[PDB]
Design an enzyme around this catalytic site. Structure first.
Site, PDB file in Angstrom:
ATOM      1  N   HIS A 128       0.798  -1.232   0.000  1.00  0.00           N
ATOM      2  CA  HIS A 128       0.000   0.000   0.000  1.00  0.00           C
ATOM      3  C   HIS A 128       0.833   1.287   0.000  1.00  0.00           C
ATOM      4  O   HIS A 128       0.268   2.379   0.054  1.00  0.00           O
ATOM      5  CB  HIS A 128      -0.942   0.040   1.216  1.00  0.00           C
ATOM      6  CG  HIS A 128      -1.984  -1.034   1.235  1.00  0.00           C
ATOM      7  ND1 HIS A 128      -3.258  -0.845   0.745  1.00  0.00           N
ATOM      8  CD2 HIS A 128      -1.955  -2.296   1.727  1.00  0.00           C
ATOM      9  CE1 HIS A 128      -3.961  -1.952   0.910  1.00  0.00           C
ATOM     10  NE2 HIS A 128      -3.192  -2.849   1.502  1.00  0.00           N
TER      11      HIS A 128
ATOM     12  N   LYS B 278      -8.486  14.254   4.405  1.00  0.00           N
ATOM     13  CA  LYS B 278      -7.587  13.102   4.411  1.00  0.00           C
ATOM     14  C   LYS B 278      -6.647  13.328   5.585  1.00  0.00           C
ATOM     15  O   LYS B 278      -6.570  14.444   6.104  1.00  0.00           O
ATOM     16  CB  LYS B 278      -6.781  13.007   3.099  1.00  0.00           C
ATOM     17  CG  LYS B 278      -6.068  14.304   2.663  1.00  0.00           C
ATOM     18  CD  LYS B 278      -5.430  14.159   1.264  1.00  0.00           C
ATOM     19  CE  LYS B 278      -6.485  14.145   0.150  1.00  0.00           C
ATOM     20  NZ  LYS B 278      -6.369  12.939  -0.718  1.00  0.00           N
ATOM     21  N   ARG B 279      -5.927  12.287   5.996  1.00  0.00           N
ATOM     22  CA  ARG B 279      -4.940  12.429   7.071  1.00  0.00           C
ATOM     23  C   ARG B 279      -3.920  13.524   6.754  1.00  0.00           C
ATOM     24  O   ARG B 279      -3.588  13.756   5.588  1.00  0.00           O
ATOM     25  CB  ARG B 279      -4.239  11.093   7.348  1.00  0.00           C
ATOM     26  CG  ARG B 279      -5.129  10.052   8.032  1.00  0.00           C
ATOM     27  CD  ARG B 279      -5.486  10.453   9.469  1.00  0.00           C
ATOM     28  NE  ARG B 279      -4.313  10.450  10.346  1.00  0.00           N
ATOM     29  CZ  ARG B 279      -4.048   9.520  11.260  1.00  0.00           C
ATOM     30  NH1 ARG B 279      -4.870   8.493  11.448  1.00  0.00           N
ATOM     31  NH2 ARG B 279      -2.948   9.622  11.998  1.00  0.00           N
TER      32      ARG B 279
ATOM     33  N   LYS C 296       0.899  14.485   1.287  1.00  0.00           N
ATOM     34  CA  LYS C 296      -0.431  14.872   0.797  1.00  0.00           C
ATOM     35  C   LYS C 296      -0.534  16.375   0.499  1.00  0.00           C
ATOM     36  O   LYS C 296      -1.493  16.834  -0.133  1.00  0.00           O
ATOM     37  CB  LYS C 296      -1.518  14.422   1.779  1.00  0.00           C
ATOM     38  CG  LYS C 296      -1.706  12.890   1.817  1.00  0.00           C
ATOM     39  CD  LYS C 296      -2.519  12.450   3.029  1.00  0.00           C
ATOM     40  CE  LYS C 296      -2.607  10.934   3.158  1.00  0.00           C
ATOM     41  NZ  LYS C 296      -3.431  10.312   2.062  1.00  0.00           N
TER      42      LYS C 296
ATOM     43  N   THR D 180      -8.326   6.813  -2.122  1.00  0.00           N
ATOM     44  CA  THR D 180      -9.705   6.332  -2.280  1.00  0.00           C
ATOM     45  C   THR D 180     -10.713   7.465  -2.082  1.00  0.00           C
ATOM     46  O   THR D 180     -11.800   7.438  -2.662  1.00  0.00           O
ATOM     47  CB  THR D 180     -10.046   5.159  -1.339  1.00  0.00           C
ATOM     48  OG1 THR D 180      -9.708   5.509   0.004  1.00  0.00           O
ATOM     49  CG2 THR D 180      -9.301   3.888  -1.745  1.00  0.00           C
TER      50      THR D 180
ATOM     51  N   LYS E  33     -14.438   8.720  -4.059  1.00  0.00           N
ATOM     52  CA  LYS E  33     -15.666   9.132  -3.361  1.00  0.00           C
ATOM     53  C   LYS E  33     -16.200  10.476  -3.869  1.00  0.00           C
ATOM     54  O   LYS E  33     -17.416  10.649  -4.040  1.00  0.00           O
ATOM     55  CB  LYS E  33     -15.436   9.206  -1.844  1.00  0.00           C
ATOM     56  CG  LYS E  33     -14.802   7.961  -1.217  1.00  0.00           C
ATOM     57  CD  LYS E  33     -14.544   8.150   0.275  1.00  0.00           C
ATOM     58  CE  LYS E  33     -13.690   7.018   0.843  1.00  0.00           C
ATOM     59  NZ  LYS E  33     -13.186   7.325   2.221  1.00  0.00           N
TER      60      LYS E  33
END
Ligand SMILES: OC[C@H]1O[C@@H](c2cc(O)c(Br)cc2O)[C@H](O)[C@@H](O)[C@@H]1O
Ligand SMILES: OC[C@H]1O[C@@H](c2cc(O)c(Br)cc2O)[C@H](O)[C@@H](O)[C@@H]1O
EC number: 2.4.1.1
Lengths: 810, 810
Positions: free
Chosen positions: B351, B542-543, B548, B650, B654
């Site tokens: 992952h 998101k985290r 990110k 992911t 969404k």
């Protein structure tokens, strides 16, 4: 099958069957193919529980609308045992459930054996609270039991190599179908911190918080449709607790440790901080709940008219300063008025005169843990001693004797003194005990406030301790005098008119024989031990303590063995001597006594010359569920504490109700039992309290008895030389040394009279008809010892409420 | 009300109402007078749960009789969220329950908000497992999720003074109606001890034992009557544990700490012993359960034909040596045969390629905790390296690179290498990611065993992520193309024929506006924050991680603010910029980024000149239940990770399904999303993976960008000088220093292209009709990203089982 177990109607049986299948499917998520016996137990438990809820909701609704005075019974122990059968009995569901399960192809008695005991108590004090809850519900009182939900109850006892081993009683592992969590009534409890004085009174600040989450358990009355509540608090950390991250979450365990485990001490004070936290935790949470309920009915003048708080021993003694704290600091009442309310609300029950059992908390502990409570205790003490000084001017020693604060190496607070000062009533638990309180340890207090001191002789519930555990006896009694005696035990007196009835004599003896056969089979099935069912069943079951004198019993057993070995071909009445009970893990002498008992059995049980004439068995893991089995099977009840040491005893009452004769000293409730039955129908021996006092003034010299009793000398020589421990000759050196040099309980002093009295027991047992007639005279006069009688006396004489046998609508 | 929510039949509504009242009475022990909103939630939960049990029992019975190959999905995380609505959706009960509760005078949506999230995961990896369970049940696979029942899930995030604060997620406080304890399937797990070699193999002795107690939760498929199981293990001390007495009981907490708390790290390896214990605990308990079930169907040749084990990342990697241990030490199989069985049974999903996220356990830890497993790992390594040496003779560096054992200061085991060696299939989670694996970090392994390497692009369940969270959109779609798309998402392509349909355009835009109004109201009601519902909703949830690039978003926000301040009277498209997500408690930089975001909002939101044109809001406590609210409300989805760092993502899928347009780099699944929708319908910017590589070879110099971009210079000067922190001028010094000197993720390198791309987003938003048409083109091509597609690929290409949409009998 039998009448007292209720009706098995077509409609009820059909409904019980369908609800059982519903729970197995929807509740347990199982079918009949993959269901275990435990699944079947839970399906039945949920089915029976359903029948409680309607009555439970409407009882509490009734109390809200009628607003009666509420009784709050505060205890650190509630020794409940199993709940399934008890609920069925009180709801008249036993025969119907038996029929329903039989039709489903299941044995109900087998399913009953799956339930774990709720072992949230040590012995007599904890079991008394349980009997009391049953009686209060049966007498229609608006009563609440408040305690702690211990994750671990009294340890399970294993015997390994003749020694006691302890293991955790993980009673909640499979779940508890009887309790209902009430997280919505969660309350904060404060610890540590410091006291700030402001212009508007004192303030307790910088505290650490533990949450108290209540779990409610229904307490059904006997067929009156009343269901009361036992509320037990569980400790929870607040969510911001210690909030690196992982350790902070793991440290939540520290707060939650408060309700983790019951302290396994019976009649012994251990001054540990965790125990003190437990004691405050229950009191603080309970008092907030009481006050909340009182306001939801401003004017605290009416508080004692609507609230009674009963303190079960000194364990919840902090209720007194906690009530004062709330009333003064939070409600802003003046001291004098708050004190008036407190005294009129609180009452205290004492359960012991043993000095080692009395709670005396070090000041430095209370200083750190509960700084505001210490301040309030000091103030109570100053005001109380001012009253003493005005009543007895110049009596400086009285002032030091009566003080709540004890001076010395470490300053301590005497919690018993606190309880007397802050309660309107103080009671002992048997007539002799209550008299000893007024004459000795609380003499100074009795002289100041004589009106405060009362007696309330203990009792046991005839539901659990006759109907449930001995249906065969309950039935033969009901056949003659009807069923009303079950909630009116005084009716048993009517059995005196059957003492010469040949049919009744035969039936009483038949019920006992059946009970003995059943227990003899239980011993082979579950423990692979062999016993003669035609022998006299001689049983002593209770916690292991020096004062209870299991050692005196041991001496008699060895005497019997030695007499057999001396004259093998002489006839003796065969006996099965059974001794059982747990020892506190830290009580060395008690652990040595257990080892002695097994060691004697090891020799006696394997001697070919003895045969089936004498057997010595240690009953492992004595607990409520085992008491329900062994007590109906007993012929002889051993109640042999040194006079003046057993406050009451309650095991004694259980044996009397179930058809055993009693060998006993004139101690605790034994005195009143003998008074009720007649001394001719009781095997009384040994020193009276007065005789012990005389020996104490002279000095007790055990050597004198050793020198003058050759049979006793032989036993002590056998113990010392290693007769009962060949591989470890000096194993019992501590026991001999204690007996010879520092025996607080005068074992030797009662030896001769005890052995002689035991000979008279064997003589009577040889005449079955006359043995049984004496038994009938005991059962017939056991009525006074119903906890219904006890609770009615508390209600009328302490709480100021009237009991009622009237049914609530079904 | 709406069609996709099912039928509200007279019979069903009446029955739901009566069963609701039954549970309120018998289960919760309440009446309508004293019932709280939480009581009403539980009554509904139990009512819905009843409908599961029949299907649950018959599904598992069906698997026993048909004996299909079983799929075991092992994960340390299952990010489930709430269960009530999901269960209603999958059982077609939503409208019926809505009607039933309405008739009882209750609002169902209000009751739904009472349920706690099952937050047993951190982010994407945990949520993927949850979507996967839903899809496996929907595709009728005999699948089991196996994990840990954490007492505490991911912490609840509080924002205090702009800083993240953590508090314990006590999600089980009020109970969990969905789980069923199975204490009868309790299994022992061993730790520590030592290895003895005998004449008959090795033996692991002197171990410490922790018990694993399973709790089962139903996983319903979409209207196919299949109910699979998620089994989560809870840690329990044995009853003889450490068995002075009190401390021994209290020390049981140590063993039970294994399942206490989820480690709150996302994409980061923390080498703590407790985490290792957690990882073995799940694997050991699970494997015993698998083998037990396999025997109850001797010959392990058929094991891989009946068992597939999927490893979710390397967290359950110990399954490989544990299976070997059981097969060799306990079942007495030869090594070669055991290895053949293991490899054919196990498959591994990677992952991440981030070096700090890769599990490398110190040898000394495994030596102490799991001595036998270390020995087995060494043996696996020796045999594997012998294969490498035979394949690539003389390539000594390859041998060191491929070794399971890493040499250095502390020797470590590379768990990723262990997983590749012992699995028959290795997959990445998006096409670009799987290619990166073959080209970079696992290049040596791909060269040895090319057949092992696969791709399985991630997906999301359209049940939770469309039907449940966005019924309005689901309905307007169903009106045109029917309901079949819900379990066949590829059918959404039919919507391309409506791209010029004026009615559909208006309906799509109406649904979004309604969602935005609802969310704007949620923000005022629950958080008292004010937003303009006509503004563009720009969201990044998101985290919080450097990769990110929440920081790049921050730079754009400040650019917009500065441009407004420079030319106040110029028109700009109004934006509401929403950023949310949790930071790992020990991740300093991530905590600083959260503070920066709030600090920007503090300035921007209170500047009178800005007005309603720009708002910056930090979304507190981002979790599954919040995602379900904010995602349907979004206009613009921020997916702006540095190319080559986000394995898949992911959240991106969404947003695409729910009518937002995407601004994003060509990273992870973004690439395939753009491929499906067409690049013209996606806002693509920034470096490609190849561009990052070129910059890395040259050396990344952030100063170059600072020197050449005046707008960027201004922002950095503002940050440094204390513009966003007047009282603490140097507050953001660490952030500036990182950006300027040690930015692993090249924030400055993508700044210009990002800002330019954002201008094009604002331009399109000015033309509502054309914005909505592009939206329709995204929704219409989102079909590939159904987890039904993903799971069908795992089934056919890895597990060797065929999916089925066939219904089981109701
Ligand atoms: O009153 C109930 C029982 O309390 C027992 C008793 C008294 C105590 O102070 C403590 Br602590 C524990 C306990 O079991 C007495 O020893 C019995 O004589 C009495 O029958
Ligand atoms: O594959 C599911 C998700 O796993 C995420 C992910 C990967 C990990 O190795 C760990 Br540890 C936690 C985690 O959330 C990835 O970062 C996402 O790109 C991906 O979509």
């Amino acid at each position: 099958q039998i009448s007292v177990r209720g009706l098995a109607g077509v409609e009820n049986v059909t409904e019980l069957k369908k609800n059982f299948n519903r729970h197995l499917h929807f509740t347990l998520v199982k079918d009949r193919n993959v269901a275990t016996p435990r699944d079947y137990y839970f399906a039945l438990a949920h089915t029976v529980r359903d029948h409680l809820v309607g009555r439970w909701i409407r009882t509490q609704q009734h109390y809200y609308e009628k607003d009666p005075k509420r009784i709050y019974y505060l205890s650190l122990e509630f020794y409940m045992g199993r709940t399934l059968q008890n609920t069925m009995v009180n709801l008249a569901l036993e025969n119907a459930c038996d029929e329903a399960t039989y039709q489903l192809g299941l044995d109900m008695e087998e399913l009953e054996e799956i339930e774990e005991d709720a072992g949230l108590g040590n012995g007599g004090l904890g079991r008394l609270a349980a009997c009391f809850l049953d009686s209060m519900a049966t007498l229609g009182l608006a009563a609440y039991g408040y305690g702690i939900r211990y994750e671990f109850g009294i340890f399970n006892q294993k015997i390994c190599g003749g020694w006691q081993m302890e293991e955790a009683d993980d009673w909640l592992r499979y779940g508890n179908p009887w309790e209902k969590a009430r997280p919505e009534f969660t309350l904060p409890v404060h610890f540590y911190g410091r006291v700030e004085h402001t212009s508007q009174g004192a303030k307790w600040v910088d505290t650490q918080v533990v949450l108290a989450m209540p779990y409610d358990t229904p307490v059904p009355g006997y067929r009156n449709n009343v269901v009361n509540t036992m509320r037990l608090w569980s400790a929870k950390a607040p969510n911001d607790f210690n909030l690196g991250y992982i350790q902070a979450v793991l440290d939540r365990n520290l707060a939650e440790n408060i309700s983790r485990v019951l302290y396994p001490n019976d009649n012994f004070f251990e001054g540990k901080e965790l125990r003190l936290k437990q004691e405050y935790f229950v009191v603080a949470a309970t008092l907030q709940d009481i006050i909340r309920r009182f306001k939801s009915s401003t004017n605290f003048d009416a508080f004692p008219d609507k609230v009674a708080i009963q303190l079960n021993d000194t364990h919840p003694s902090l209720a007194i300063p906690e009530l004062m704290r709330v009333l003064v600091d939070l409600e802003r009442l003046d001291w004098d008025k708050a004190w008036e309310v407190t005294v009129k609300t609180c009452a205290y029950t004492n359960h012991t005169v043993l000095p080692e059992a009395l709670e005396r908390w070090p000041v430095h502990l209370l200083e750190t843990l509960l700084p505001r409570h210490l301040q309030i205790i000091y103030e109570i003490n100053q005001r109380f001693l001012n009253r003493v000084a005005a009543a007895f001017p110049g009596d400086v020693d009285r002032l030091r004797r009566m003080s709540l604060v004890e001076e010395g190496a470490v300053k301590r607070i005497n919690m018993a003194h606190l309880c007397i000062a802050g309660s309107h009533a103080v009671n002992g638990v048997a007539r002799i005990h209550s008299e000893i309180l007024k004459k000795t340890i609380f003499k100074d207090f009795y002289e100041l406030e004589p009106h405060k001191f009362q007696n309330k002789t203990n009792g046991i519930t005839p539901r659990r301790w006759l109907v449930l555990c001995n249906p065969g006896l309950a039935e033969i009694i009901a056949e003659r005098i009807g069923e009303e005696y079950i909630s009116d035990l005084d009716q048993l007196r009517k059995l005196l008119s059957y003492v010469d009835d040949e049919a009744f004599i035969r039936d009483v003896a038949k019920v006992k024989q059946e009970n003995k056969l059943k227990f003899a089979a239980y011993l082979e099935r579950e423990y692979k031990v062999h016993i003669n069912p035609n022998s006299l069943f001689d049983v002593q079951v209770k916690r292991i303590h020096e004062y209870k004198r299991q050692l005196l019993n041991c001496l008699h057993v060895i005497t019997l063995y030695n007499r057999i070995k001396k004259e093998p071909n002489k006839f003796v009445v065969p006996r099965t001597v059974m001794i059982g009970g747990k020892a506190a893990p830290g009580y060395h002498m008690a652990k040595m006594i257990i080892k002695l008992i097994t060691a004697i059995g090891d020799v006696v049980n394997h001697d070919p010359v003895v045969g089936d004439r004498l057997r010595v068995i240690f009953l492992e893991n004595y607990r409520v569920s085992l008491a329900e089995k062994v007590i109906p099977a007993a012929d002889l009840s051993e109640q042999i504490s040194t006079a003046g040491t057993e406050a009451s005893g309650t095991g004694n009452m259980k044996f009397m109700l179930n058809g055993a004769l009693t060998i006993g000293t004139m101690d605790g409730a034994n005195v009143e039992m003998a008074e009720e039955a007649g001394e001719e129908n009781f095997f009384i021996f040994g020193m009276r309290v007065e005789d012990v006092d005389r020996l104490d003034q002279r000095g007790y010299n055990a050597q004198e008895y050793y020198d003058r009793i050759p049979e006793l000398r032989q036993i002590i020589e056998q113990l010392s030389s290693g007769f009962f421990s060949p591989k470890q000759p000096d194993l019992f050196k501590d026991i001999v040394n204690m007996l010879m040099h520092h025996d607080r309980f005068k074992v030797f002093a009662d030896y001769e009279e005890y052995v002689k009295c035991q000979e008279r027991v064997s003589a009577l047992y040889k005449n079955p008809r006359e043995w049984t007639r004496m038994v009938i005279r005991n059962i017939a006069t056991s009525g006074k010892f119903s906890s219904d009688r006890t609770i009615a006396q508390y209600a009328r004489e302490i709480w100021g409420v009237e009991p009622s046998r009237q049914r609530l609508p079904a």
